[PDB]
């Protein structure tokens with residue numbers, strides 16, 4: 001439902017996912033924007049998706065950072081969150097610009113979006129230490145948020161969980177598997193991706209390609225898929241997700257998509273074990 | 281209407297017409313295309329809009345321009361001044377017509393139009409006519425007819441052309457151009473037609489094979505479309521060494537909007553001189 005989705009479908013069909021994402025990014029510049037975190041069109045109130053034991057003092061809460069995928073939304077963390085029930089509080093925070101009302105305004109810049117989320121999270125979490133968690137584009141967003149919280153809000157997270165991140169220096173698998181990634185996005189549709197949400201996705205992709213100098217002091221858990229998403233020539237190097245100097249690395253069953261789709265308990269299990277290790 | 285129109289409207293507000301046209305061009309790459317003149321999804325049969333007296337007298341062929349808000353009505357006001365004087369045919373621009381396939385390149389579109397024009401005109405000499413982007417297209421078609429179809433037209437009428445190397449005034453006035461498109465809307469510009477417009481704008485910025493030998497009538501607006509400092513030079517439309525130059529009242533838009541009879545009069549006088 002919309003020209004942009006028809007164009008996107010054709011671009012994937014023609015193996016030009018990367019070229020089309022640049023088009024979405026350029027076109028997104030002409031969507032109405034918010035320039036201050038106060039001027040955000042949506043209420044970014046996190047949703048509590050799992051509850052920890054009533055038992056509840058100085059214990060870290062999980063914050064799921066919604067990813068960039070235009071087919072995403074409130075359903076993203078439902079499978080993963082069930083594995084945190086009776087273990088940890090799990091809050092899912094929306095990503096600004098993906099909402100309806102009257103479509104949501106897009107952030108003028110990434111810091112503006114991060115500030116809006118940071119405020120929402122600090123209000124919701126109260127005094128509890130926060131561990132940020134994201135998958136793919138959301139993993140990249142989780143780190144950027146962690147740095148923003150530390151520098152602009154004096155509130156560095158207790159940790160960051162990065163599920164299958166592909167940061168700017170490790171792009172080759174993204175490029176070699178762009179058809180599978182584009183196909184994965186159509187495969188994951190519950191409804192047709194709207195043009196507004198495809199534009200939001202392009203705007204964030206471009207934000208995340210740009211110069212992001214700061215490194216969070218929070219410790220990092222790197223969670224990596226164990227199965228390749230598609231064919232990969234061995235002499236290219238390692239296809240696996242990467243992060244510079246993680247505190248801990250965990251490997252789980254599944255590929256880039258199925259690690260969360262079919263093997264969410266294994267992801268949750270890695271996170272819980274790691275949180276116990278960093279807390280005492 | 282569609283998202284592209286909404287984005288375009290904002291781009292014009294932001295004085296970023298040129299940037300958005302580039303977005304439309306890049307996006308048009310992902311529309312279904314035709315790569316052979318025969319593979320054109322649409323019938324390009326010219327429509328007869330005016331009838332001349334009932335001999336080897338030239339017929340006029342209107343070359344439809346690129347504007348996403350244009351189409352069938354483009355030459356209606358002009359054509360009335362040709363009734364009882366000359367036959368006037370309007371040829372559609374491929375990709376504007378389930379939506380029409382876009383040409384893979386300009387030559388493919390030109391070939392489709394050439395073939396349709398040659399069967400409609402028959403024995404008669406053809407004088408091509410276009411306005412603005414359509415003027416640039418009329419010349420490109422004239423060249424393709426001569427090169428590839430062994431049939432140079434008898435003349436070309438260029439109504440306010442701004443060819444590569446001479447486009448500073450239309451770049452400077454791009455906001456007025458964008459505003460003109462929305463003002464000239466009869467229905468909301470579709471996303472498909474906006475994409476066609478970007479694709480053709482890109483074709484016309486590309487390197488072209490050469491110059492037609494057909495004589496040119498250059499028709500220029502007398503009033504500037506926007507602000508212009510005298511010290512900047514001439515803002516007027518340009519063509520290298522035309523056979524004849526005619527200046528008419530109006531601006532880029534109104535020369536056709538309000539002053540079409542003056543354009544027609546210049547064309548009629550010139551056809552008499554070249555015949």
Ligand SMILES: *P(=O)(O)CC(=O)[C@H](C)[C@@H](O)CC
Nearest residue numbers: 068136137138166174205208
């Ligand atoms: P992920 O969000 O599943 C895949 C990914 O990293 C894409 C290609 C980037 O656009 C996200 C910033």
Ligand SMILES: *P(=O)(O)CC(=O)[C@H](C)[C@@H](O)CC
Nearest residue numbers: 412413414416442450481484
């Ligand atoms: P005209 O079509 O009003 C403006 C013009 O000269 C065209 C769009 C060129 O700039 C592009 C071929």
Ligand SMILES: [Mg+2]
Nearest residue numbers: 242243244245
């Ligand atoms: Mg390293």
